[PDB]
Coordinates of N, CA and C in Angstrom, one line a residue:
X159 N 77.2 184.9 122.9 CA 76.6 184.4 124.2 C 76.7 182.9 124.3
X160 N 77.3 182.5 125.4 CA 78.0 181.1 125.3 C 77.5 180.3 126.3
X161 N 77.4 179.3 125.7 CA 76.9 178.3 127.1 C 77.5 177.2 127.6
X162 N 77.6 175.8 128.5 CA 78.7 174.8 128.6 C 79.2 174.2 127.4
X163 N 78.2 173.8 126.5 CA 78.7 173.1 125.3 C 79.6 173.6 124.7
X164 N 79.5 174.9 124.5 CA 80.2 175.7 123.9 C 81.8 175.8 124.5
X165 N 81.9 175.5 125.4 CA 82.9 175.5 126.2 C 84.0 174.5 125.6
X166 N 83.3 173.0 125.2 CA 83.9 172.1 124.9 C 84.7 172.0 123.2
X167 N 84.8 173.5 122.7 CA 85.5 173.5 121.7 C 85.9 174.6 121.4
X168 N 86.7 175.3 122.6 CA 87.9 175.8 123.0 C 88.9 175.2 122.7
X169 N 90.1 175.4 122.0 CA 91.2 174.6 121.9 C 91.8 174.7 122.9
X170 N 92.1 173.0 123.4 CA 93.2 172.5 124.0 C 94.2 171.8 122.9
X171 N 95.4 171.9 123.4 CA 96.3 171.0 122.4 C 95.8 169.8 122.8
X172 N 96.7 168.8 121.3 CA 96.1 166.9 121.7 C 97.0 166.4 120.7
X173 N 97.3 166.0 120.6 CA 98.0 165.2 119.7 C 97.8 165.0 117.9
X174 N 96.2 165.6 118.0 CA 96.3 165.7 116.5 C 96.3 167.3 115.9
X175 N 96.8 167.8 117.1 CA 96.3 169.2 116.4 C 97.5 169.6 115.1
X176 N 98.1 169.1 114.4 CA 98.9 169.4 113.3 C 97.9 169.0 112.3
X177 N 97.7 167.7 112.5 CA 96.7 166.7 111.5 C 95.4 168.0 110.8
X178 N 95.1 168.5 112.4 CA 93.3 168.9 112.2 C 94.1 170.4 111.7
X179 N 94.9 171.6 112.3 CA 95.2 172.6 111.3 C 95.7 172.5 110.0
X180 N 96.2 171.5 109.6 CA 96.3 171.1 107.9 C 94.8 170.5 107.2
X181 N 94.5 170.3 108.0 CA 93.0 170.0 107.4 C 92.2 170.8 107.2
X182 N 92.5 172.0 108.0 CA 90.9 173.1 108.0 C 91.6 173.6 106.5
X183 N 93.2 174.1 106.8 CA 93.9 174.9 105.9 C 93.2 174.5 104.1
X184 N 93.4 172.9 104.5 CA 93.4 172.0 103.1 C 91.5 172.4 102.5
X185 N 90.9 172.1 103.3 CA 89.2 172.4 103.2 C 89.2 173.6 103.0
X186 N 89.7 174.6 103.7 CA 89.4 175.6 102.8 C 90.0 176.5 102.1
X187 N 90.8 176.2 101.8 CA 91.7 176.4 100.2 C 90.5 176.3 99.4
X188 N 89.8 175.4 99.4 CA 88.7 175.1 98.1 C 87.0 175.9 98.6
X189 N 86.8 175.7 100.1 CA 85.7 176.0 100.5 C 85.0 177.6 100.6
X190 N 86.7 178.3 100.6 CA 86.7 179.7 100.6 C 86.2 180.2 99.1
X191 N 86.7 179.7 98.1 CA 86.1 180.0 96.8 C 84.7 180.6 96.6
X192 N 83.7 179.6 97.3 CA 82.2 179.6 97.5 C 82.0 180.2 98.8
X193 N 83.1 181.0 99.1 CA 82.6 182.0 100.6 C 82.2 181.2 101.8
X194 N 82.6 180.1 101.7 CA 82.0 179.1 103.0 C 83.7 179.0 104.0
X195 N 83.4 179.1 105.4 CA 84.3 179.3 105.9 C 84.3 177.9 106.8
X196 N 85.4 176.9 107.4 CA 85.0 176.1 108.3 C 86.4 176.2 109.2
X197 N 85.9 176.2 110.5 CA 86.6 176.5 111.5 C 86.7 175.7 112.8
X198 N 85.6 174.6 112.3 CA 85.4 173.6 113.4 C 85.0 171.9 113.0
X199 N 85.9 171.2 112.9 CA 86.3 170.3 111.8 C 85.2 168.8 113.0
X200 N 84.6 169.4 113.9 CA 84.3 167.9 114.8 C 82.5 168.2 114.7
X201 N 82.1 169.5 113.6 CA 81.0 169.2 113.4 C 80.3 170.0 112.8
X202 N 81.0 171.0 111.7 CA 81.1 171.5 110.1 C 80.5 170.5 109.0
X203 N 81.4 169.4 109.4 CA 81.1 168.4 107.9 C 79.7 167.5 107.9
X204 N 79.4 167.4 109.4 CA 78.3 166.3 109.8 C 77.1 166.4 109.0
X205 N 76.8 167.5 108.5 CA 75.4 167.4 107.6 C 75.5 166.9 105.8
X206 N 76.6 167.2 105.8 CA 76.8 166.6 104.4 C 77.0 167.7 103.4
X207 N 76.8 168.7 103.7 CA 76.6 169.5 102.3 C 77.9 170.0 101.9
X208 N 79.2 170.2 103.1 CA 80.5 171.0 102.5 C 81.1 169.6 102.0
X209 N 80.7 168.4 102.4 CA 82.0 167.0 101.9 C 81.6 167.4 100.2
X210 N 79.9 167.5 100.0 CA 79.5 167.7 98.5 C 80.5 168.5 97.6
X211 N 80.1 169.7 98.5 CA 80.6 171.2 97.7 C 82.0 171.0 97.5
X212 N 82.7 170.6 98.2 CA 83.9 170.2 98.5 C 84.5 169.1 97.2
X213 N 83.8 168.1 96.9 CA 84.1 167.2 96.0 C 84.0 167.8 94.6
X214 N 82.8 168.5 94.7 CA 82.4 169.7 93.6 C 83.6 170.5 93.2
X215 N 84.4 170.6 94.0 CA 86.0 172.0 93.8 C 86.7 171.3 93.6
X216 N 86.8 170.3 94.1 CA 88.2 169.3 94.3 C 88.2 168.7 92.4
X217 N 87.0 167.9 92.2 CA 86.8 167.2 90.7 C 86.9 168.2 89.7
X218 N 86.7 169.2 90.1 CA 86.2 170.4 89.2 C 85.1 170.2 88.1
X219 N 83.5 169.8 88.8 CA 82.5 169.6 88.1 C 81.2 170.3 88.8
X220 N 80.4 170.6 88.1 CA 79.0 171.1 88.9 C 78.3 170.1 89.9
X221 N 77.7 170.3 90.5 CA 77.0 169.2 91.2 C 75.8 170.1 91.4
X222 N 74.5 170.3 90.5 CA 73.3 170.9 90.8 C 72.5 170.5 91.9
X223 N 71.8 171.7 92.9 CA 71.4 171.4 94.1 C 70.2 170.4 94.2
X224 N 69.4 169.6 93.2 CA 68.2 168.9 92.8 C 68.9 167.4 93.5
X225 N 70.8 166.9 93.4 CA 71.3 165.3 93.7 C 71.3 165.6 95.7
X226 N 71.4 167.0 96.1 CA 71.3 166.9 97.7 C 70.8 167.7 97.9
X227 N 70.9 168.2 99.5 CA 70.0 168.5 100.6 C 71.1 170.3 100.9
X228 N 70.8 171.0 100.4 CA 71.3 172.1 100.7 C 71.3 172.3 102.3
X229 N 69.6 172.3 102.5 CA 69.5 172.4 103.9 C 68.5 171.4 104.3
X230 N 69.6 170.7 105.0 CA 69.2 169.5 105.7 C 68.0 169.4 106.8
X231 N 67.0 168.7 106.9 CA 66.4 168.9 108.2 C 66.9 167.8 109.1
X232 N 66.2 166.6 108.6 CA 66.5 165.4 109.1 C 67.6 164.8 108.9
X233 N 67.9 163.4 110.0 CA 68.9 162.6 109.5 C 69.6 162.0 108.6
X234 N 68.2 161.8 108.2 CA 68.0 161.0 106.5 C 68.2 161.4 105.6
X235 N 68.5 163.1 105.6 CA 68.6 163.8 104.2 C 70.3 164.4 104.2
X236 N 70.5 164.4 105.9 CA 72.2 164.6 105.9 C 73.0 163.1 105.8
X237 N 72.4 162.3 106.2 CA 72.9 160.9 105.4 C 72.9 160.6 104.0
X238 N 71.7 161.2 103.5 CA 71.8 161.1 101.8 C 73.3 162.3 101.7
X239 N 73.2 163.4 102.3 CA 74.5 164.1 101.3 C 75.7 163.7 101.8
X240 N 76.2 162.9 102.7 CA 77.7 162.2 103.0 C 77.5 161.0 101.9
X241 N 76.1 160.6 102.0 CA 76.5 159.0 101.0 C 76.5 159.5 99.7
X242 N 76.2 160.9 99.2 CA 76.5 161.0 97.7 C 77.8 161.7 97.5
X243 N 78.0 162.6 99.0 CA 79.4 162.9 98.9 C 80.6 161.3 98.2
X244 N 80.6 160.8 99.4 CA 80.8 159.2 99.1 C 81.2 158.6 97.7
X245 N 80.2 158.6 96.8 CA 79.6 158.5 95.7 C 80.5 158.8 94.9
X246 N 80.6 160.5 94.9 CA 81.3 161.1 94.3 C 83.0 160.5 94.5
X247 N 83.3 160.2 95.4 CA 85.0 160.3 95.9 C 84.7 159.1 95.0
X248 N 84.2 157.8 95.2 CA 84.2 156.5 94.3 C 84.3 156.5 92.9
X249 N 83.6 156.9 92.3 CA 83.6 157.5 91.6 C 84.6 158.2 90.5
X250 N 85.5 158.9 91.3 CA 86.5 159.6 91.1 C 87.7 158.8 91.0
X251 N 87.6 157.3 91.9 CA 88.9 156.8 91.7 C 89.3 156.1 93.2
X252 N 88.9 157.1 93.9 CA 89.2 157.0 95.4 C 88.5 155.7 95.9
X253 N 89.4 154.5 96.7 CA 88.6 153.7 97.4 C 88.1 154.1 98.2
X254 N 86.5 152.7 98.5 CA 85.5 153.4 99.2 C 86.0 154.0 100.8
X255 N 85.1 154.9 101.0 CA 85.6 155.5 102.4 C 85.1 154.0 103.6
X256 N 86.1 153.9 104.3 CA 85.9 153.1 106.0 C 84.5 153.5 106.2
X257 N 84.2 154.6 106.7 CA 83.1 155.1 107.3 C 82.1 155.2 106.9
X258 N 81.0 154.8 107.6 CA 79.6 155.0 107.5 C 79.0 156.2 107.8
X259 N 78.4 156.5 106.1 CA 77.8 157.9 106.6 C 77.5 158.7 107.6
X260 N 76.7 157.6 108.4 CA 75.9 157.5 109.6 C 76.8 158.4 110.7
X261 N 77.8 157.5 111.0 CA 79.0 157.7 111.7 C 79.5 159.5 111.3
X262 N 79.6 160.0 110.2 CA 80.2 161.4 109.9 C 79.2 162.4 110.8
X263 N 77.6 162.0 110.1 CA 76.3 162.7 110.6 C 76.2 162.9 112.1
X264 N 76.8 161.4 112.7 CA 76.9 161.5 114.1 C 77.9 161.9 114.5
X265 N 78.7 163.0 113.4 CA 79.8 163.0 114.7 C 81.3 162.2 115.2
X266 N 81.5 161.0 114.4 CA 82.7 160.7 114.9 C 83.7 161.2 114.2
X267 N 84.7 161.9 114.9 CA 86.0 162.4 114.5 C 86.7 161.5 113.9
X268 N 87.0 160.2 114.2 CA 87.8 159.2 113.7 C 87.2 159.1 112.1
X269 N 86.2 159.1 111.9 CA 85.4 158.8 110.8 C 85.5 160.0 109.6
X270 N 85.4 161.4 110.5 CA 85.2 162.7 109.7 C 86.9 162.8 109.1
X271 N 87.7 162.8 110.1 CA 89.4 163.3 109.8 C 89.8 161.9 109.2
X272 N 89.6 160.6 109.1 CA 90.0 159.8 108.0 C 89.4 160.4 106.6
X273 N 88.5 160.5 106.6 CA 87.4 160.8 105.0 C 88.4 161.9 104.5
X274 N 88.5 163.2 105.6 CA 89.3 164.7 105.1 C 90.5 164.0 104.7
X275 N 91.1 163.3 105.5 CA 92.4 162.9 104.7 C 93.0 162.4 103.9
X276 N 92.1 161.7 103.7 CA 91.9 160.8 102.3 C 92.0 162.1 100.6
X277 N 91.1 162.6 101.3 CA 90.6 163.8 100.2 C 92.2 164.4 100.3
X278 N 92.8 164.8 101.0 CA 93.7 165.6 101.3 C 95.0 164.9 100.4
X279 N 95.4 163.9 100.8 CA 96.1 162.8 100.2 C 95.9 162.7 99.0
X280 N 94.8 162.5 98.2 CA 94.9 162.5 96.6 C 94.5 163.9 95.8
X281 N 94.3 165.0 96.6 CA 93.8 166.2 95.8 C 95.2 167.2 96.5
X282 N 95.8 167.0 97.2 CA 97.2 168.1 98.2 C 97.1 169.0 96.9
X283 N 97.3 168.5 95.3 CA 97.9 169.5 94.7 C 97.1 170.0 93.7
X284 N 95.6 170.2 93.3 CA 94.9 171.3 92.9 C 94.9 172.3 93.8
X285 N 95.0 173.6 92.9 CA 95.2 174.5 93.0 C 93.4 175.2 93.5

């Protein structure tokens, strides 16, 4: 049952659509593992919990649910899981990400599809 919003993520082609289908492809190569599916890359990631789970597959380490917000209510607790996502990529090696947590939670694509790519770029070849 659909309403206008809903309308507005219908695919039209755009110029990044190679970028964003190598991206979902790349996310969930690892995401599928844990039965988590993502199919909508402009506001899947904004709460913070798949960049986690995600870094979790990628490093190949546990990340117990006590350091984030499984289920986010507030702002503040999906800003805590992009900035420990964050954390984790630093951590790992990766310079820090451009983007401000803030910016993923809210939403900006420029912000979300640099971060994925980044990930994408140094992890392309686990399996």
């Amino acid at each position: 049952e659909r309403d206008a919003f809903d309308t507005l993520f219908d695919h039209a082609p755009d110029k990044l659509s190679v970028v964003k289908k190598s991206l979902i492809t790349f996310v969930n190569k690892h995401l599928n593992k844990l039965n988590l599916e993502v199919t909508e890359l402009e506001t899947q990631f904004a709460d913070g919990v798949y960049l986690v789970l995600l870094m979790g597959l990628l490093e190949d380490y546990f990340v117990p649910l006590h350091h984030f917000y499984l289920t986010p209510e507030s702002f503040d607790q999906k800003v805590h899981n992009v900035s420990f996502a964050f954390e984790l990529m630093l951590d790992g090696g990766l310079k820090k990400p451009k983007a401000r947590p803030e910016d993923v939670v809210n939403l900006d694509l420029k912000s979300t599809l640099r971060v994925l790519y980044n990930l994408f770029t140094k992890y392309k070849n686990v399996e």
